[PDB]
Write an enzyme that holds these catalytic residues in place. Structure first.
Site, PDB file in Angstrom:
ATOM      1  N   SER H 170       2.504  -9.274  -2.212  1.00  0.00           N
ATOM      2  CA  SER H 170       2.752  -8.002  -2.887  1.00  0.00           C
ATOM      3  C   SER H 170       1.660  -7.823  -3.928  1.00  0.00           C
ATOM      4  O   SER H 170       1.353  -8.749  -4.665  1.00  0.00           O
ATOM      5  CB  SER H 170       4.136  -7.941  -3.516  1.00  0.00           C
ATOM      6  OG  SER H 170       4.300  -6.718  -4.226  1.00  0.00           O
ATOM      7  N   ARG H 171       1.047  -6.646  -3.967  1.00  0.00           N
ATOM      8  CA  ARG H 171      -0.146  -6.476  -4.792  1.00  0.00           C
ATOM      9  C   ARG H 171       0.162  -5.900  -6.146  1.00  0.00           C
ATOM     10  O   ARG H 171      -0.578  -6.114  -7.109  1.00  0.00           O
ATOM     11  CB  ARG H 171      -1.200  -5.609  -4.092  1.00  0.00           C
ATOM     12  CG  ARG H 171      -1.937  -6.324  -2.997  1.00  0.00           C
ATOM     13  CD  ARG H 171      -3.326  -5.774  -2.827  1.00  0.00           C
ATOM     14  NE  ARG H 171      -3.655  -5.646  -1.407  1.00  0.00           N
ATOM     15  CZ  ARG H 171      -4.649  -4.911  -0.934  1.00  0.00           C
ATOM     16  NH1 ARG H 171      -5.432  -4.251  -1.770  1.00  0.00           N
ATOM     17  NH2 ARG H 171      -4.869  -4.845   0.379  1.00  0.00           N
ATOM     18  N   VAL H 172       1.255  -5.152  -6.221  1.00  0.00           N
ATOM     19  CA  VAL H 172       1.567  -4.433  -7.443  1.00  0.00           C
ATOM     20  C   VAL H 172       3.028  -4.584  -7.896  1.00  0.00           C
ATOM     21  O   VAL H 172       3.463  -3.904  -8.828  1.00  0.00           O
ATOM     22  CB  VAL H 172       1.105  -2.933  -7.358  1.00  0.00           C
ATOM     23  CG1 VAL H 172      -0.408  -2.823  -7.489  1.00  0.00           C
ATOM     24  CG2 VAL H 172       1.557  -2.284  -6.066  1.00  0.00           C
TER      25      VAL H 172
END
Lengths: 305, 116, 239, 265, 119, 48, 303, 203, 116
Positions: H170-172
């Site tokens: 998950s990037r954010v």
């Protein structure tokens, strides 16, 4: 030196180095940089071939470096697709071979009647993923009188020039070697092959005998003896005694990390003492029987420090 | 060398030879594993695997992914650090210590932490 | 294809009467079953068994469609069926035969699947039954659809298939299903090009199958009949 | 990642997986053959050494190292050479004779001027007393065996099939034998060199047992190792198979495009 | 239990053992003195009440134990149901080699051979 | 041979067309080689 | 024999070869040599197909060899591209399948009502570096009732015909075999199957079971080598395949299996011409004939 | 729930199980099954996009699910090849990126000034023999805010949901997650992601 | 055989079988060395290697490359020497003696010249 598809600063960075070496007084760079029109890129090598054809026609010898044909073809592809001529393989035009063949044939060594002028060509070609079986390389590979294959794997493990002896050839061969170099390089290239042979069998890590360990020790040292720093070309008479020391196995009892220091320390001593040999090799280009003697003595002498 | 200087130049090459060797063996180790490597080979691998983990660095901006507050090593700092490892001056340290830390000081730290 | 209204809300097992099948790889009612294996494995005997058993146990007919047929095997099948009396020239048959052999041109070979399917779709809507529609071989239907595309001068898709490949399958498969009136269940022979389950053809086909039935040489050699592999033949309705 | 390559790449692995699977099954039969010689030697170790249990004999050191010349059998030599250096800490200047090259190669790199003699052509068939006597003889010959304060043979003991064990065992010499506490209980007639013989023959016998056990521990290792090779090349084959089909597939599409584009014009 | 060749181990309860010792034949019995002796190249025999079974042997060691167990160890070994011309033709080549370090080994053969003839 | 081997010449003169089915014929063939080692470097090769 | 895009000198020599065996008198060569217009190379096999059917339709039997279909497809291609019909995989038209299906579906065994005539087909297909996935080989393999599979590997080993047995199938199979040959060979595919699986064991310590398997296999493989142009009569095959399968060659060394066949058959001819005659005539093997052959073999193998 | 290229049967049962859990009352389903027209299957995610967009605009929260984009892409390859645009990689038109990019860019979180509505794209790519490196997947991963790579080898061993850790990210959200869990899962990610390369050096 | 005689055809076939075997065994040679071989095999390989070399030959044209004088061999001399090689009537001579020479004369000549 023909710059094809290079960025300008990179041609700059290069003419600087030529000057840093007072090498610009005898060169002509011809530039068709990255930003110029496809037609100029495609044309450069031809225009250049003519610039140095002047030399060949007039009794002198030029050297043309085409850096690099992969791009010339990229651009020649661009004229054609846009002129709408229907495409060949990988969208190249049908005669992308003819393109290069006619350029590269323009290099030749004229006869006495015609002034004995030569023109010599070093085209460059860039592959992808080591694949030499892609269109253009294949084309040029069969056009030229041999290749020098450079390899990334070789590079990173310390062979620089990362020449691949296994695959590199000069089809003229010994005809263009200096007699002295020829004499002491007898069989080296075949031997270096046998060396890779025994080194592949070494991967079995099963015990070696006195014959295989023998050629392994020499091949490792020979390999190491050919490594060379950029910007340092050596005179023949510097090369010759090195090769002779390696081949006749005077290097074979010396630590591998130390062969570096051997090279310059050797040359230093040969200049100092037996300069009379070094100057004969040069002047004569051929190791007479006594010169082999003096050199033989001279090497042994030094190896005992 | 004309720019970074003989040492940084050489600490580099030797690091690469090490890594390139590890790479050459990726196949034998894949099938035969480590036990079939020789002695010199065996070392290079354990060393390369350390150099490899040591090349990883926590980034401050990427903190929301490591968790560990990010580090910035210096040029003189890095070269020395790697040179020491290439002189085997740390061979006796678990490979994990080299992973995701700053300079060579951080390695000796984490290894003491884990050796407890 | 039967609108989103006329849809079955629940998945349901079709009983076949075959132990291996029902126990391990049970069939969807109005579902699609990928049948795997060449010769030497009693494929046609097994097919005939299902035609018989769907007729006998349930009470619905079967339509066998030969797509890209080798004619030899059409003559065999037809005779073997009479010999087994699933076809009864004198009394009654349980199966309609719709052949579309190799020698026929690409258009023919594309449509036969529909030709047969149409026939089967009558017994589900008019007579509200649980019909078996056989397709041998669903791959060569694909193949044929490709040739049609090339001849029609359309640009080939990936790996030379028809750009239309997905929807082409859809149009076919989406008529094979359960309605409130009844159901058409299909057993479709599946060839796998170059043994590559990732080739567009099987890829796109598996997208519709609900159960595979894999007969096997190893299983016949051990004397086990039917030669269904108990381990491979997997049903996505065994939950 | 061309198709030409990937194909032949995938071949030579299949060809490897073949060999490794042959290896495994061949070891299985060879371990059955060397199972019976590890029961017939570890039993003759019984009748022999029991005398020593009753007259409890407690012991310029001579270490004899035992393995083979063969690789492809995991850490047999690697971890035996380590227990030999573990014990070679407490006497940095102890002489070694090595049987089998792989151990010699190992120690030759670390205690390079400890070793004085070496034997080879060993772990091919099951060892016999005929050898076990000739090595014992040459140990008496050049090595000056009896004239050693202490002798210990180092070998890989087989604990199961999956695991072995680096092991040590003491040889005692003529003087140690006379001097043993309960030697008095045994009415051995001092009728000419009698403990000497017992030594000279406990050196051959002990050596045999070790070799039988060492070989049968190695065969187990070779079997297990080759076994894992087959599992891996097995898993590799699977990967390259998948990669092969991709390349194939694209080769078809990229090849096709070249034509389509040529054709529209 | 206790009577072993390296390739083949033999015996297990015993009422009388005859052995060819270092100095002349001897006989161990139900309770005997604990002894070690070099076993000379000659015949041996087991007992189980009145049971006669004689073997030949190469030589080795015997060891009567305090706990009373006799341990006999040799290398190679049924009586005449084992070893005439096999012996004869070999005896020829044996004596021949003696006339030759190398011929010293043949000396060992003459005594070992001459012994076997008597069986 | 020796004493160590005494009973391996008394067992190999006493080896020499019956029991020799694999077992003993092979107990008689040993393929070993010794080599003495000096200052790294060896001495010479010879059959055991 | 339908010759497609062959060097005329080859064809000439193939003629000069059948005339040297008096085979011409019952053969037809339709020739569409290397240098002829593509249409002719496209047409020749259909052209010859219709020649065969004459015999089929007239209660007789022909067999037809297409040498080769690879080159016919190449020809069809030339025509299409030039006519600027749209190309697919490898630049073949969509109906390249339909081309070959049409051709080979014409081969058949007709029913009693049709005169029961027949046409058999031997299409030749040329792989490239062994590629059965290659576009054309795919089509054709999926039309035919099986393949006879050749490999230069087996060929340089000296196994000629160089038939890969593991890869060759005939979907028709059992049903088409001289009952007698099928009698002494149901075991043959069995033995050679297990011999392919224990083959790599040919390199020191093998148990007597898998030792034995290697003993049959080598001999059996040897028995199926056969110099060119010398095809064997059935009554000449069944003895050799009998002595093989039932283990009468295991004693014989592997190099003598050559001269074995020659001498066996000529001996069987003089001293047992009667059993040979029964095989040739009855086409099956009596319980008596099996003891006859057995006895005659054990006699020759002893001698 | 967009249902791109799915079966009519699959959707029925998928609605059934959404009604069986009552979740129907709060969900809209748009479906363009495998029979329907190429430009329907193509237009479907977009029109669903606007449907969801209404909530993100009127200060609410919506969760759109694109199941799947790989079948949407394929419908586009259809039209694009029938309209005779040149084929790129895997016969895909040069704009197949822009298709998904211009779609996903709509799933979004708004500023306090615009009601703070939000729309959450859960697109689904389906790979081929586990291939992440493929031309479609790369395009979508280079569009999305991370990915949950589900590996079959784990799922065949009964590990469910079979999330490959060292390939999911998950990037954010590692700044969007519930505190409580983040506190109690200190670094858990690369623990397991570097746990996988270790246990794969034991056998 | 019909064109060149049986003997020629048999030599030519055997030479081929030899090399084909030697090719087939190069798997087992890499992996388990030359050690792990049947005795017939060990000899087949010994003979195959000797044969590989006897197939090379200095061309006259290529003197610029070998510095070795061009050797031309008569067809009967070819077959005879290979025949000889094949039956083992040359098993003692070292591999190098067959490399870049003409007829079996030259194999003997070189064998001795080198052993000197």
């Amino acid at each position: 030196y023909v710059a094809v598809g290079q960025k300008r600063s990179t041609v700059a960075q290069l003419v600087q180095t030529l000057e840093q070496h007072d090498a610009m007084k005898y060169s002509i760079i011809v530039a068709a940089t990255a930003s110029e029109a496809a037609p100029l890129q495609y044309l450069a090598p031809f225009t250049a071939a003519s610039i140095g054809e002047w030399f060949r026609d007039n009794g002198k010898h030029a050297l043309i470096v085409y850096d690099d044909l992969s791009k010339q073809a990229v651009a020649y592809r661009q004229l054609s697709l846009l002129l709408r001529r229907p495409p060949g393989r990988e969208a190249y035009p049908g005669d992308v071979f003819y393109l290069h063949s006619r350029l590269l044939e323009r290099a030749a060594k004229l006869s006495e009647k015609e002034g004995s002028g030569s023109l010599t060509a070093l085209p460059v070609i860039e592959t992808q993923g080591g694949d030499v079986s892609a269109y253009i390389p294949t084309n040029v590979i069969s056009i030229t009188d041999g290749q020098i294959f450079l390899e990334a794997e070789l590079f990173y493990k310390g062979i620089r020039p990362a020449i691949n002896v296994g695959l590199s050839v000069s089809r003229v061969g010994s005809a263009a070697q200096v007699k002295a170099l020829k004499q002491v390089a007898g069989s080296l290239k075949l031997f270096l092959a046998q060396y890779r042979e025994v080194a592949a069998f070494a991967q079995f890590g099963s015990d070696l005998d006195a014959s295989t360990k023998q050629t392994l020790v020499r091949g490792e040292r020979l390999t190491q003896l050919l490594k060379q720093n950029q910007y340092s070309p050596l005179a023949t008479e510097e090369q010759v005694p090195l090769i002779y020391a390696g081949v006749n196995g005077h290097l074979d009892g010396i630590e591998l990390s130390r062969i570096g220091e051997f090279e310059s320390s050797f040359l230093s001593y040969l200049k100092s003492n037996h300069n009379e040999l070094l100057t004969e090799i040069r002047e004569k280009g051929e190791l007479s029987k006594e010169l082999l003697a003096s050199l033989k003595s001279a090497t042994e002498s030094f190896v005992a420090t | 060398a004309a720019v970074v200087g003989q040492e940084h130049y050489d600490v580099a090459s030797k690091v690469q030879e090490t890594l390139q060797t590890y790479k050459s063996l990726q196949d034998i180790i894949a099938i035969l594993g480590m036990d079939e490597l020789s002695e010199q080979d065996k070392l290079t691998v354990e060393r390369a695997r350390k150099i490899q983990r040591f090349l990883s660095q926590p980034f401050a901006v990427a903190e929301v992914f490591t968790g560990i507050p990010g580090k910035l090593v210096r040029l003189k700092d890095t070269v020395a650090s790697f040179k020491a490892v290439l002189e085997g001056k740390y061979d006796n340290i678990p490979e994990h210590a080299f992973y995701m830390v700053g300079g060579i000081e951080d390695v000796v730290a984490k290894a003491e932490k884990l050796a407890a | 294809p039967p609108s989103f209204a006329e849809q079955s809300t629940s998945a349901e097992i079709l009983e076949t009467g075959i132990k291996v099948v029902d126990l391990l790889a049970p069939y969807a009612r109005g579902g699609k079953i990928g049948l795997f294996g060449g010769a030497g494995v009693g494929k046609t005997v097994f097919i005939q068994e299902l035609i018989n058993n769907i007729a006998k146990a349930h009470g619905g007919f079967s339509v066998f469609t030969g797509v890209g047929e080798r004619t030899r095997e059409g003559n065999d099948l037809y005779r073997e069926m009479k010999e087994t009396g699933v076809i009864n020239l004198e009394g009654e048959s349980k199966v309609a035969l719709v052949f579309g052999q190799m020698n026929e041109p690409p258009g023919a070979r594309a449509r036969v699947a529909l030709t047969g399917l149409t026939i089967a779709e009558y017994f589900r809507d008019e007579e509200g039954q649980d019909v078996l529609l056989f397709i041998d071989n669903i791959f060569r239907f694909t193949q044929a659809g490709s040739e049609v595309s090339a001849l029609l001068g359309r640009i080939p898709s990936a790996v030379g298939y028809q750009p239309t490949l997905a929807t082409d399958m859809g149009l076919l498969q989406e008529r094979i299903t359960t309605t409130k009136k009844g159901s058409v269940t299909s057993v479709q022979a599946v060839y796998v090009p170059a043994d590559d389950l990732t080739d567009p053809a099987p890829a796109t086909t598996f997208a519709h199958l609900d159960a595979t039935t894999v007969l096997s040489r190893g299983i016949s050699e051990l004397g086990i009949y039917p030669a269904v592999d108990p381990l491979d033949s997997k049903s996505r309705l065994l939950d | 990642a061309t198709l030409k390559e990937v194909e032949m790449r995938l071949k030579s692995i299949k060809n490897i997986e073949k060999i490794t699977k042959t290896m495994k099954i061949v070891a299985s039969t060879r371990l059955s053959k060397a199972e019976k010689a590890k029961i017939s030697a570890k039993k003759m170790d019984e009748a022999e050494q029991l005398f020593y249990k009753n007259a409890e004999t407690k012991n310029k050191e001579l270490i004899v190292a035992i393995t083979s010349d063969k690789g492809l059998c995991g850490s047999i030599h690697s971890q035996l050479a380590k227990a030999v250096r573990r014990h070679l800490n407490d006497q940095p200047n102890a002489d070694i004779v090595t049987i089998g090259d792989k151990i010699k190669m190992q120690l030759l790199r670390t205690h390079p001027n400890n070793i004085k003699l070496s034997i080879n052509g060993i772990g091919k068939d099951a060892p016999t007393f005929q050898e076990s006597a000739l090595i014992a003889d040459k140990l008496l010959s050049v090595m000056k065996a009896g004239t050693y304060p202490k002798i210990s043979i180092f070998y890989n003991d087989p604990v199961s099939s999956l695991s072995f064990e680096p092991s040590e065992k003491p040889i005692f010499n003529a003087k140690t034998i006379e001097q043993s506490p309960s030697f008095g209980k045994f009415e051995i007639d001092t009728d000419a060199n009698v403990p000497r013989d017992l030594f000279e023959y406990t050196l051959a016998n002990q050596m045999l047992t070790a070799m039988a056990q060492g070989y049968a521990a190695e065969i187990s290792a070779r079997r297990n190792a080759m076994d894992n090779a087959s599992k891996n090349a097995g898993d590799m084959i699977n990967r390259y198979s998948i990669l092969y089909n991709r390349t194939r597939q694209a080769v078809i599409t990229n090849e096709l495009v070249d034509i389509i584009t040529g054709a529209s014009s | 239990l206790q009577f072993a060749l390296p390739h083949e181990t033999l015996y297990s309860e015993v009422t009388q053992v005859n052995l060819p010792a270092k100095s002349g034949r001897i006989g161990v019995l139900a309770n005997h003195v604990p002894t070690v002796e070099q076993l000379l190249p000659g015949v041996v025999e087991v007992m189980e009440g009145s049971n006669s079974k004689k073997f030949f042997i190469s030589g080795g060691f015997a060891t009567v134990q305090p706990d009373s167990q006799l341990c006999v160890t040799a290398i190679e070994a049924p009586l005449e149901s084992f070893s005439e011309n096999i012996k004869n033709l070999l005896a020829e080549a044996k004596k021949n080699v003696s006339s030759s370090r190398e011929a010293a080994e043949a000396a060992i053969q003459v005594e070992v051979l001459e012994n076997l003839q008597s069986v | 041979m020796s004493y160590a081997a005494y009973l391996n010449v008394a067992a190999q003169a006493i080896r020499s067309t019956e029991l020799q089915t694999a077992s003993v014929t092979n107990r008689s063939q040993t393929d070993a080689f010794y080599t003495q080692y000096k200052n790294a470097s060896e001495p010479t090769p010879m059959t055991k």
